[PDB]
Amino acid sequence: GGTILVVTGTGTGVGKTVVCAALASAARQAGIDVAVCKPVQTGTARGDDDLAEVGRLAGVTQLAGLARYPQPMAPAAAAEHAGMALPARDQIVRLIADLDRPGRLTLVEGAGGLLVELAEPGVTLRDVAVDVAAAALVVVTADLGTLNHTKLTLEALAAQQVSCAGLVIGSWPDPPGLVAASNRSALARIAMVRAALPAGAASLDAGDFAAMSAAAFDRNWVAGLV
Amino acid sequence: GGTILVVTGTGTGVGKTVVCAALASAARQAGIDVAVCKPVQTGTARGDDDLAEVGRLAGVTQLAGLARYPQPMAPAAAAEHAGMALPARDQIVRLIADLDRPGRLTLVEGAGGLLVELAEPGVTLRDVAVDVAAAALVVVTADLGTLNHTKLTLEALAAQQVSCAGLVIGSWPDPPGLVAASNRSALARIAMVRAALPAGAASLDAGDFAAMSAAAFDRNWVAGLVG
Numbered sequence: 001g002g003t004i005l006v007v008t009g010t011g012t013g014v015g016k017t018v019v020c021a022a023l024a025s026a027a028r029q030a031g032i033d034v035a036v037c038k039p040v041q042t043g044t045a046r047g048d049d050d051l052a053e054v055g056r057l058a059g060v061t062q063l064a065g066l067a068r069y070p071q072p073m074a075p076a077a078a079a080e081h082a083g084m085a086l087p088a089r090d091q092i093v094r095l096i097a098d099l100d101r102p103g104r105l106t107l108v109e110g111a112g113g114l115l116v117e118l119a120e121p122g123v124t125l126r127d128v129a130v131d132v133a134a135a136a137l138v139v140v141t142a143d144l145g146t147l148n149h150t151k152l153t154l155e156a157l158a159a160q161q162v163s164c165a166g167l168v169i170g171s172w173p174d175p176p177g178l179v180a181a182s183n184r185s186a187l188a189r190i191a192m193v194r195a196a197l198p199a200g201a202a203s204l205d206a207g208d209f210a211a212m213s214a215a216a217f218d219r220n221w222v223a224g225l226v
Numbered sequence: 227g228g229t230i231l232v233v234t235g236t237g238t239g240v241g242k243t244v245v246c247a248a249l250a251s252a253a254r255q256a257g258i259d260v261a262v263c264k265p266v267q268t269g270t271a272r273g274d275d276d277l278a279e280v281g282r283l284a285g286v287t288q289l290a291g292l293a294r295y296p297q298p299m300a301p302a303a304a305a306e307h308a309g310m311a312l313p314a315r316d317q318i319v320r321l322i323a324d325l326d327r328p329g330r331l332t333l334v335e336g337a338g339g340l341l342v343e344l345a346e347p348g349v350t351l352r353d354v355a356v357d358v359a360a361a362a363l364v365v366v367t368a369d370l371g372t373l374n375h376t377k378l379t380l381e382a383l384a385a386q387q388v389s390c391a392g393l394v395i396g397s398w399p400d401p402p403g404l405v406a407a408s409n410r411s412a413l414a415r416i417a418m419v420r421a422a423l424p425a426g427a428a429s430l431d432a433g434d435f436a437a438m439s440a441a442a443f444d445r446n447w448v449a450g451l452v453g
């Protein structure tokens with residue numbers, strides 16, 4: 001196989017998707033073939049599509065998914081509102097397994113935090129990471145409360161021997177300020193900060209996003225991912 | 227000894243202080259002697275004082291502080307900014323142990339979430355709960371992300387064998403709405419919801435705060451906390 005990376009986060013809306021796109025772009029620019037799998041998409045009525053965002057910002061074509069729920073809720077509540085079950089655990093695991101190949105960086109996005117229900121019954125992105133032997137990139141804020149949430153998310157990963165690939169700060173404010181700076185220094189002491197995406201980067205055009213993305217990660221750490 | 231509860235949260239500003247004041251009020255109204263305890267307090271340059279809010283809202287007089295910092299930051303950062311160290315682990319334990327008394331319920335409020343550093347080095351409210359053999363009451367939101375943060379907090383408690391005494395929704399809107407209704411329903415499938423304090427409980431005067439508090443918790447649960 002190749003390298004599988006779940007991109008989780010301390011919660012909903014911390015920037016997992018733009019981080020997938022940003023790492024996908026950096027990898028592709030280093031000559032690494034990239035796949036992204038978002039098994040369950042929600043909020044489709046209002047037009048949410050995290051896979052399309054990655055395809056537009058990073059140019060990935062291998063973009064796999066299984067389920068789309070109209071309501072902008074967590075997967076399990078959106079499926080309960082729609083009256084239709086989430087996908088099954090095997091379905092997601094096999095989909096990621098079949099995307100995987102040597103020379104390929106395969107990224108996997110769930111929804112919200114590490115423990116939100118992703119399949120029936122009650123199976124999480126952690127269970128998926130364990131099943132496909134993926135390591136975990138953890139996207140965090142630099143804002144109030146981030147150390148507590150980052151530490152809780154790391155404990156849950158380590159509890160099932162899901163390896164921490166590093167942290168990414170999903171949105172790095174400009175100018176930093178005293179809180180963001182202070183918080184970044186402290187996260188830097190509990191795990192490697194692989195990147196800090198500048199605030200608003202999800203709305204750049206693909207040229208700027210690629211340039212921004214290649215400056216955001218360390219060229220050698222990306223190269224060695226596969 | 228008596229009963230020691232740590233009152234933690236899924237994060238900062240979820241209402242741990244108002245829950246302390248509310249559980250204190252309800253326990254007092256059951257005739258239970260209450261002490262409340264706040265080892266680390268930040269933001270004194272802004273007038274933040276959680277022990278004082280608990281005293282104001284619930285009439286508690288047995289209020290024990292220890293470390294105080296001017297800046298409203300994480301304790302580590304606030305103490306750094308003030309050129310001080312966090313207290314040691316044994317000083318937080320001494321503060322709590324000195325308060326413990328048979329027939330007494332001693333509430334210990336941390337700062338922010340469960341794994342926030344409260345004592346050098348990297349010592350948390352969970353470590354402190356272990357040292358004093360306290361259960362943990364988890365204050366949560368009914369907002370976006372609560373399930374994940376609550377499940378992560380509950381799992382970290384069980385990982386150190388710290389018993390969980392339940393959830394309190396620190397701020398509960400009237401009327402709930404679809405999001406808060408959905409979350410309270412889901413939180414209650416994973417633990418006991420001991421209370422859901424009506425939003426704005428901190429603006430109730432002494433008399434109404436005590437009525438709210440007596441109705442917010444199940445008296446039989448409150449009374450069964452303390453032998």
Ligand SMILES: Nc1ncnc2c1ncn2[C@@H]1O[C@H](COP(=O)(O)OP(=O)(O)O)[C@@H](O)[C@H]1O
Nearest residue numbers: 012013014015016017072073074111112116371
């Ligand atoms: N646990 C959850 N509870 C409620 N809504 C959620 C949850 N997880 C995802 N969502 C919905 O999915 C949208 C995108 O979330 P997510 O992809 O996790 O953000 P990001 O990719 O920026 O980290 C959110 O705006 C929200 O509408």
Ligand SMILES: Nc1ncnc2c1ncn2[C@@H]1O[C@H](COP(=O)(O)OP(=O)(O)O)[C@@H](O)[C@H]1O
Nearest residue numbers: 145238239240241242243298299300337338342
């Ligand atoms: N980890 C932290 N990071 C930043 N600020 C904190 C932290 N912990 C406590 N504070 C400060 O203490 C104040 C109240 O926090 P807390 O007592 O945890 O809230 P509540 O009692 O409402 O749950 C906040 O306004 C914040 O400034």
Ligand SMILES: [Mg+2]
Nearest residue numbers: 016017050109
């Ligand atoms: Mg996303």
Ligand SMILES: [Mg+2]
Nearest residue numbers: 242243276335
């Ligand atoms: Mg407080």
